[PDB]
Write a structure and sequence with these properties.
The structure is cut from a larger assembly and holds 1 copy of chain A (48 residues), 10 copies of chain B, 1 copy of chain C (37 residues), 1 copy of chain D (120 residues), 1 copy of chain E (224 residues) and 1 copy of chain F (48 residues). Chain D has 120 residues and is of the alpha+beta class. Chain D has helices at 86-100, 103-119; strands at 2-5, 17-22, 25-30, 38-40, 43-49, 52-58, 61-65, 71-75. Chain D folds into 2 domains: 1-84, ATP Synthase, domain 1 (Sandwich), CATH 2.60.15.10; 87-119, no CATH class. Chain F has one domain (1-48). The chains are: A mainly alpha (48), B mainly alpha (74), C mainly alpha (37), D alpha+beta (120), E mainly alpha (224), F mainly alpha (48). It is classed as hydrolase.
């Protein structure tokens, strides 16, 4: 497992007693998409 | 007799051999402690292997000791 | 299973056999010296 | 000195002794300590500035002693007390579920975090 | 004539049975025994392709295979405790080693002229020790003549001598008074462990021979 | 074994070297290529 | 006779050298332990059975040696 | 003579010394196996036959030594 | 008597050799201690008792060599 | 005569001592192999020949010691 | 007697051999000190009592060896 | 007969000198394998250095061997 | 005579002890260089530490040497 | 006669032991060289002279053992 | 007479054993020099006078052995 993915998940997991704040929840919960682009054209826009 | 003396002497010289085994066993166990402190989790595979490494180191010592009895009696 | 194939067995492997022959002659003399005891 | 900067927050960004869990085992930095680059593993952390000590539970990050005694710690999140039992319970259930269900890597980080949290 | 002659015949007959009737008839699927000799074929094919690795790897693939199989079978048969070693006669094993070694050096000389002597300086060094580095390279080169054989001979022999001497000791363990024949399982266990080991050190030497005299042919074909 | 020094060395060695040369020829023409025949037959069905 | 008593005391002396090896072994286990702990102080309870085990087995080899030494010395 | 007989036993005793190097050798191989394996978690499919090879070879010197000890004593 | 008395003094010297392993051993534990305390800073409270235990055990094996020396020397 | 045959036997015993240095040596090469392989994950194609070479020469030095043991022992 | 008096002068020398172990040991403690103190420049005040202790104990094993020499010389 | 006795004994003692070289060879090769594995690519420069260290360590052993032969053959 | 022979031999035996001291001195100096190179700046504190370790290592050799002189010269 | 000539032959054997140490000493210098060069890469041009100096001195000690063998003969 | 002549040669021979430690020692100081200089690229000016000092001292121990060897050989 890639290290920066490992740390990200670690932060999220640590955000999962339960006295955590909204900025924490925002810092660990988000919805996004990304798009592969030719070269131009758009090979499928796959969710993040 | 010189022969009577000789069997006692031969037992002495062979007995020194045990020294190497005393170091050897410890080197296997030391590496076990270092590995397990590094991983927290190497131990499940490694602990059977560590007992094996100990056995082999000890086994060399038993050959030396057996030579001591062959000298001492013979 | 078995079949006779005409594979190389001598046209590359001569020096191995030659070395065996040299030791064979010398071993005749060695055997004769040891057969005296 | 010390910095314990976070993205939207910060936690300490001359701090006297700092105790860190690192890929060199555990490391202590005291006054001037030799300058390092260590990626911080997920951690239970103690930071002392004078005798006063603040105890932090950390998402992992990076540790970098700068040679001027500026201990750059950057981590994504880190008090210990905010994290400090029901949360551990939730993680146990989640650890189990992810254990059955990259999916491996997820289960592994979850086992680590559940333990790390249990330490808190 | 001799005992030795009888065991050379026995080795030949085992190897014939291993390649004429290790498989029921002739199959493209193979019987459970022939699965081994497929894996063996591949680990020695890919080993002398891994070593010598030329287009002449396969020209020395019969050579490396009959050096494997001879030593592999004769250090399992010889490990039967009433079997008269062919390998505990040093005079045969060392002679076989020197024979193969001379057959590498002579072949190297034949193929690569007197520029064979360029092997004995692989690389430049300061000139007052250039001649030095030819002499104590050639000394190490024909130490290879006896080293390959004496390793194998000593190993196989030491297993047999250990067993016979220890057989004499476990007899005298029972001649020691009967209080020693309470919890007397340990000398039997020592021989059992040695017997587990003795097959292992016989198969390991058969592979080690065949990799080292692949390395010597690697050196002889591809100089420096 | 207690005794393992012959004087019958040239006798031993005559039968010994006969077994080595025998196994080389025997492998090379018979037993090694009959395995390669299995390989090539399997591969020939695979390749078609 | 003097030779017999001499041989007893000499044979004992010779054996005594063997003891050193087990002594080095013990030291190595504790050095490893100390390094392991400083690098990961939470290993300790899992390690504790293994630590005592490695120490004991190392030491034991020396004690076997020592028994031969006294057997020779006293007769 | 008494002297020839003495030399057999004494020569055998002296011979027994060589075994120690192989004992330490085996331990070093297993230590290295543990160390490599603790570093990778997964090198082992390659490394395990390499380690067994090192073990067998290190052991062999000890066995050679032991063989000579019997040859001097009994032979 | 001259032979056995000469044997006592020789045998004592042989026994003294066994001590060397323990001497190096003490250092090995303490070298680890010094390094370990430097890694953590504060590991020392737990570890200092472990270090003393390790030294004592290594030393004891050495002392076994010494007691054989005095048994040979005096009788 | 008695002395000369004795001296041959004694000389044989001493020769066996030489093996130990090779024994420790072989283990060092194989330890290094495992260290190297654990360091690279993939060095083995070049390095396995290098390691075999280092084993061989280290071993050979021991074998020389063994061979003198045989010459003296049998002769 | 010449044999006994000779034995003292030989025996003194034999005893002296043990002392080498402690010498190497002391160096090892100081080496660790240098490396430790380098790794955290300010660890010195805590570590330095421990360092001198490790030296003293290692040295002590050397003292015991040297005592046996003085006992043979001046007993 | 003391002189003849000493020749055979002396030869035996000579093997001990060789043992150090056996360790020595391994040490150079240990460094080689470590260096090469860390870099991959250091090897082309480093391999001449390794062979040199091997040869020099070996030569010390060669001297011991020559003395052994000098006694043995006379 | 035997006694005079024993003085010369005895002195020789004592000389073996010095080897440990030589290795010891070097180990401290090796560490000195490592410490200095590691910090660039530990050197003024580390230099007396290094000297102390050398001196003590040397001392064990010195004790062997004076015992050697006592047997040798008388 | 017998005792002294005998002692020379024994003594020659004993002297070889010193040589073993020098073999290891030389090896350590070259091992260090390889380690330094492999960590740094580029250090080699300065470091190779240092290695030769260190080698020579280690070997010299062994030379002292060897010449004493010659003296004893 | 003969016994004494033999003895002078012997005491000198034993003394050569001492020389070995200085050889290995010299290598260790130089090894550190190389390792430091390779670590820093630039420590060398500070480290070099320290290295020469350590070399000289390590060598000197072997020199003492050598002069004692000469004193015993020559008288």
């Amino acid at each position: 497992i890639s290290y920066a993915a490992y740390l990200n998940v670690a932060a999220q997991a640590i955000r999962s007693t339960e006295l955590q704040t909204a900025s924490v929840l925002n810092r660990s919960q988000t919805d996004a998409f990304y798009t592969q682009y030719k070269n131009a054209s758009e090979p499928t826009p796959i969710t993040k | 007799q010189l022969v009577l003396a000789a069997k006692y002497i031969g037992a002495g010289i062979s007995t020194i051999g045990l020294l190497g085994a005393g170091i050897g066993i410890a080197i296997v166990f030391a590496a076990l402690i270092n590995g397990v402190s590094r991983n927290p989790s190497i131990k499940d595979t490694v602990f059977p292997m560590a007992i094996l490494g100990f056995a082999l180191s000890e086994a060399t010592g038993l050959f030396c000791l057996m030579v001591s009895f062959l000298l001492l009696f013979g | 299973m078995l079949k006779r194939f005409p594979t190389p067995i001598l046209k590359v492997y001569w020096p191995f056999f030659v070395a065996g022959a040299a030791v064979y002659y010398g071993m005749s003399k060695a055997a004769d010296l040891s057969s005296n005891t | 000195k010390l910095q314990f900067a976070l993205p939207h927050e910060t936690l300490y960004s001359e701090v006297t002794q700092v105790n860190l869990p690192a890929k060199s085992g555990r490391i202590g930095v005291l006054a001037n300590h030799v300058p390092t680059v260590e990626q911080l593993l997920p951690g239970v952390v103690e930071v002392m500035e004078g005798s006063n000590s603040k105890k932090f539970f950390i998402s992992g990050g990076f540790a970098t002693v700068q040679p001027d005694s500026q201990l750059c710690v950057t981590a994504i999140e880190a008090p210990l007390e905010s994290f400090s039992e029901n949360i551990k319970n939730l993680l146990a259930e989640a650890k189990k579920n992810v254990s059955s269900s990259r999916e491996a890597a997820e289960a592994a980080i979850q086992v680590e975090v559940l333990e790390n949290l249990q330490s808190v | 004539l001799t005992t030795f002659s009888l065991y050379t015949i026995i080795v030949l007959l085992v190897i014939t049975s291993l390649y004429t009737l290790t498989n029921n008839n002739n199959k493209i699927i193979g019987s459970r025994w022939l699965i081994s000799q497929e894996a063996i074929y591949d680990t020695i094919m890919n080993m002398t392709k891994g070593q010598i690795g030329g287009k002449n790897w396969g020209l020395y693939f019969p050579m490396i295979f009959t050096l494997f199989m001879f030593i592999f079978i004769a250090n399992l048969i010889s490990m039967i405790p009433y079997s008269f070693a062919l390998s505990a006669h040093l005079v045969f094993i060392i002679s076989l080693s020197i024979v193969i070694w001379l057959g590498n050096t002579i072949l190297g000389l034949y193929k690569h002229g007197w520029v064979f002597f360029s092997l004995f300086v692989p690389a430049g060094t300061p000139l007052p020790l250039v001649p030095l580095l030819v002499i104590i390279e050639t000394l190490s080169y024909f130490a290879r003549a006896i080293s390959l054989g004496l390793r194998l001979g000593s190993n196989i022999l030491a297993g047999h001598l250990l067993m016979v001497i220890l057989a004499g000791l476990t007899f005298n363990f029972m001649l020691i008074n009967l209080f020693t024949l309470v919890f007397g399982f340990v000398p039997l266990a020592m021989i059992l462990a040695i017997m587990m080991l003795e097959f292992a050190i016989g198969i390991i030497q058969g592979y080690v021979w065949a990799i080292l005299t692949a390395s010597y042919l690697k050196d002889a074909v591809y100089l420096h | 074994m207690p005794q393992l020094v012959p004087f019958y060395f040239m006798n031993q060695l005559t039968y010994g070297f006969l077994l080595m040369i025998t196994l080389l020829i025997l492998f090379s023409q018979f037993f090694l290529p009959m395995i390669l025949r299995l390989y090539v037959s399997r591969l020939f069905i695979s390749k078609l």
